[PDB]
Amino acid sequence: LTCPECKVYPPKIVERFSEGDVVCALCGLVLSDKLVDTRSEWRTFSNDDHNGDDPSRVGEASNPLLDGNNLSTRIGKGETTDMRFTKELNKAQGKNVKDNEVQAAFAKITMLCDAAELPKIVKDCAKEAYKLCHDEKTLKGKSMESIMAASILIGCRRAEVARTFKEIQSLIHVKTKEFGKTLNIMKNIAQNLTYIPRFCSHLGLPMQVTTSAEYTAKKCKEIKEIAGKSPITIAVVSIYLNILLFQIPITAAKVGQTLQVTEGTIKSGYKILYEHRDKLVDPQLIANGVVSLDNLPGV
């Protein structure tokens, strides 16, 4: 819209919703009189009416981004209904029904996220990653239970939900090298800090320990003390340093068990970091019990 009388390039116009008019703010000419409430109009599509009494409720919302435009009701039981005609009209929908059934692979993603404790924004990215790569010739014939296992880490890597590839190896399934190549052909079409909360919780450490481990691990990387060790190992090692520094300790066996790393490996990172333990700790860390920097195992 632009005022026919004035015409200034930045067309300064207001929507006086309350009087249901669209006005030109300069000359005051009314540019439109019919004006509709979009909130209440949207209430007619997505309501709270599941019973069926609302006369205002007359439509339904859909998702054109995920399921395209497939409008379709379902034959079901009503108040006055014979259980015979429901069966026939449903047995008649069976002859009219392959790819309109591969949408049940969304039910595979939804049941995987809920088994992996994943948010509602991750499922919808995993379902959009799967819809745009399951019929690709670039994926061709990859393990069909390992291409949807790869599109879940694609949806997590945008929704900022920290999930290692070994965390999705535990869910399903994953063949490592098989869902690692598939996680790249689709990509063409974590850190220390990520694990620390969970590992610490299982460890049963206090916030103080978590924060310091978190600070050490970052510094370890910043310092580049651990050249190429896996972040999981770095984190487990840092957790070892901080915890040992505090009162409630945790052993390598226990840390490794939670981090799902091996003591030997944690040892490997730990000793690399130990030399710069001083630099690593948070500045206002309070070593307690009897574990000061000098005394830390050093192992």
Binding site: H50, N51, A115, I172
Partner: protein, 49 residues
């Protein structure tokens, strides 16, 4: 027979959350006849209320 794949937690979790929230005491987002108003928001106008 992977356990995590077998038991769907969301079944009972969101199944109760639905009832308590909306108030249609039944399963689930496909409710009728279900009895609406079983669960409702607590009046906090006055203490007696």
């Amino acid at each position: 027979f992977n356990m995590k794949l077998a038991i769907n937690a969301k079944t009972i979790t969101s199944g109760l959350k639905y009832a308590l929230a909306t108030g249609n005491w039944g399963e689930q987002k496909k409710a009728m006849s279900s009895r609406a108003g079983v669960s409702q928001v607590l009046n906090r106008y006055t203490y007696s209320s």
